[PDB]
Design a protein around this motif. Sequence first.
Motif, PDB file in Angstrom:
ATOM      1  N   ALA A 123      -2.895   5.235  -2.978  1.00 12.51           N
ATOM      2  CA  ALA A 123      -4.177   5.867  -2.591  1.00 12.51           C
ATOM      3  C   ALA A 123      -3.870   7.279  -2.114  1.00 12.51           C
ATOM      4  CB  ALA A 123      -4.863   5.083  -1.500  1.00 12.51           C
ATOM      5  N   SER A 159      -5.044  10.651  -0.532  1.00  8.34           N
ATOM      6  CA  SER A 159      -6.111  11.378   0.195  1.00  8.34           C
ATOM      7  C   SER A 159      -5.455  12.519   0.959  1.00  8.34           C
ATOM      8  CB  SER A 159      -6.885  10.493   1.136  1.00  8.34           C
ATOM      9  OG  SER A 159      -7.879  11.268   1.806  1.00  8.34           O
ATOM     10  N   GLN A 173      -8.905   5.745   7.024  1.00  4.12           N
ATOM     11  CA  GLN A 173      -9.785   4.681   6.476  1.00  4.12           C
ATOM     12  C   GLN A 173      -8.990   3.761   5.546  1.00  4.12           C
ATOM     13  OE1 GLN A 173     -12.929   4.524   3.127  1.00  4.12           O
ATOM     14  NE2 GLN A 173     -13.655   5.887   4.740  1.00  4.12           N
ATOM     15  N   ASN A 174      -8.069   4.298   4.749  1.00  2.33           N
ATOM     16  CA  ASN A 174      -7.552   3.499   3.612  1.00  2.33           C
ATOM     17  C   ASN A 174      -6.694   2.356   4.117  1.00  2.33           C
ATOM     18  OD1 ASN A 174      -9.069   4.887   1.785  1.00  2.33           O
ATOM     19  ND2 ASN A 174      -7.430   6.259   1.145  1.00  2.33           N
ATOM     20  N   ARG A 230     -10.200   9.894   5.637  1.00  3.08           N
ATOM     21  CA  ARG A 230     -10.037   8.943   4.501  1.00  3.08           C
ATOM     22  C   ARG A 230      -8.628   8.366   4.514  1.00  3.08           C
ATOM     23  NH1 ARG A 230     -13.950  12.503   2.638  1.00  3.08           N
ATOM     24  NH2 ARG A 230     -12.485  13.907   1.559  1.00  3.08           N
ATOM     25  N   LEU A 259       0.854  -1.219   0.000  1.00  2.00           N
ATOM     26  CA  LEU A 259       0.000   0.000   0.000  1.00  2.00           C
ATOM     27  C   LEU A 259       0.873   1.246   0.000  1.00  2.00           C
ATOM     28  CD1 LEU A 259      -2.767   1.301   0.214  1.00  2.00           C
ATOM     29  CD2 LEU A 259      -2.501   1.142   2.735  1.00  2.00           C
ATOM     30  N   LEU A 281      -8.393   4.727  -7.287  1.00  2.00           N
ATOM     31  CA  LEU A 281      -9.719   5.153  -6.764  1.00  2.00           C
ATOM     32  C   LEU A 281     -10.406   6.042  -7.786  1.00  2.00           C
ATOM     33  CD1 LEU A 281      -8.752   6.022  -3.089  1.00  2.00           C
ATOM     34  CD2 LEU A 281      -9.510   3.860  -4.021  1.00  2.00           C
ATOM     35  N   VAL A 312      -7.717  -1.508   4.297  1.00  2.00           N
ATOM     36  CA  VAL A 312      -7.622  -2.488   3.189  1.00  2.00           C
ATOM     37  C   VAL A 312      -7.055  -3.822   3.701  1.00  2.00           C
ATOM     38  CG1 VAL A 312      -5.307  -1.813   2.346  1.00  2.00           C
ATOM     39  CG2 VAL A 312      -6.968  -2.813   0.751  1.00  2.00           C
ATOM     40  N   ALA A 321     -14.106   2.810  -2.024  1.00  2.00           N
ATOM     41  CA  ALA A 321     -12.645   3.058  -2.081  1.00  2.00           C
ATOM     42  C   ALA A 321     -11.942   1.803  -1.560  1.00  2.00           C
ATOM     43  CB  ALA A 321     -12.304   4.303  -1.315  1.00  2.00           C
ATOM     44  N   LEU A 322     -12.400   1.267  -0.419  1.00  2.00           N
ATOM     45  CA  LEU A 322     -11.727   0.094   0.175  1.00  2.00           C
ATOM     46  C   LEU A 322     -11.901  -1.128  -0.713  1.00  2.00           C
ATOM     47  CD1 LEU A 322     -12.402   0.680   3.897  1.00  2.00           C
ATOM     48  CD2 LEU A 322     -10.141   0.441   2.791  1.00  2.00           C
ATOM     49  N   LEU A 330      -9.339  -0.737  -3.562  1.00  2.00           N
ATOM     50  CA  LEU A 330      -7.949  -0.945  -3.099  1.00  2.00           C
ATOM     51  C   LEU A 330      -7.752  -2.435  -2.874  1.00  2.00           C
ATOM     52  CD1 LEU A 330      -7.393   1.964  -0.497  1.00  2.00           C
ATOM     53  CD2 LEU A 330      -6.731   1.901  -2.933  1.00  2.00           C
TER      54      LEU A 330
END
Length: 318
Positions: free
Chosen positions: A264, A266, A274-275, A271, A14, A214, A278, A248-249, A252
């Motif tokens: 990703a 952001s 949040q990412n 967010r 990631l 995304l 994944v 989005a998740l 990913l």
Amino acid sequence: QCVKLNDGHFMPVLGFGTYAPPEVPRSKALEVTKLAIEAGFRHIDSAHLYNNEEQVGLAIRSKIADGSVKREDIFYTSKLWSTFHRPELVRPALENSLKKAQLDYVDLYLIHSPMSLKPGEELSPTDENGKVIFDIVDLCTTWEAMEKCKDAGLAKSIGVSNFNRRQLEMILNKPGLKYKPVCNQVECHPYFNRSKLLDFCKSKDIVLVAYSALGSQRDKRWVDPNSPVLLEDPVLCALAKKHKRTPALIALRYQLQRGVVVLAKSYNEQRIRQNVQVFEFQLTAEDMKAIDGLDRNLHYFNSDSFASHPNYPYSDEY
Ligand SMILES: NC(=O)c1ccc[n+]([C@@H]2O[C@H](COP(=O)([O-])OP(=O)(O)OC[C@H]3O[C@@H](n4cnc5c(N)ncnc54)[C@H](OP(=O)(O)O)[C@@H]3O)[C@@H](O)[C@H]2O)c1
Ligand SMILES: C[C@]12CC/C(=N/O)C=C1CC[C@@H]1[C@@H]2CC[C@@]2(C)[C@H]1CC[C@@]2(O)Cc1ccccn1
Ligand code: NA
Ligand code: NA
Ligand code: NA
Ligand code: NA
Ligand code: NA
């Protein structure tokens, strides 16, 4: 959660995308790059072109000096811009990025694009009608100068971006090749899943790194506002509700389960945190097949200016 690159270095799967449009203050890149590191991002994607290496560097230096991370925990990517393809221009371009970021080395240095541009002061050199001026450079000579950058210890790994299969093969078949590209960073998302190029990269032990995973920032200057909005896709939205995640998740996680390294971007605190979710859930094989079915060969970024470049990577689509 890392992948072993074909030079024995390790890349986190990631990555944090640091590009923001020019209208976004440069202070934000410092703020959100520190938030990304706090949230658990360790792969940080930047470039000369993004006008942010000073701020991204300073966020990395800050989180090392604050005791949060060590230099070796961070995987920093920079990119050689298309005005610096002439081989004698490559190492000074990397040294300039290292000076701006105040790092001793980048983990990864890419050829940003195969579409060489005329050297000069201007990053977009343009004629009297704003037509960009192209350069003819054998990118094997650019690649040999990248290889010297790795031998100098200024880049741990080297790779490319926006290359098609023919352009990868030009490097793979270079006489006296010393270092394969570790990756090809390309536009990759469920509307352009690059399944054939992915298989090709897998067969050559090159990592595919997905950008606009995304669906892009949909900036007017680059992206048709009529293009379908990835994160409103009904299949992604139905899968988000099924898993109690977000579109989005899903987008990913799709990339992770197909062996793609995903970026990703952001600039939003919620967010960004949040990412990293994944890693917390899995799609079924049937979920993966349904996302595969969304493919429509849709690149979000278009430029009639670059469409005519000899090294335009989409160049023989029709
Ligand atoms: N090699 C190349 O040529 C190339 C080209 C383009 C980009 N890149 C790299 O790839 C990175 C990412 O691609 P991208 O810039 O097109 O953006 P992206 O990753 O496709 O993200 C697009 C948008 O998604 C939003 N977003 C992020 N997380 C979200 C979430 N959990 N829920 C809802 N929305 C979310 C973001 O808005 P907010 O900021 O408002 O959250 C962002 O503007 C870039 O930053 C850059 O590092 C490379
Ligand atoms: C400005 C830009 C769009 C917004 C953005 N969001 O994260 C990030 C960037 C930075 C990289 C830019 C890109 C636009 C397209 C550029 C200029 C690319 C590099 C090389 C490329 O020529 C690649 C290409 C692809 C598709 C069609 C024609 N050309
Ligand atoms: Na880029
Ligand atoms: Na070939
Ligand atoms: Na578009
Ligand atoms: Na095309
Ligand atoms: Na054509």
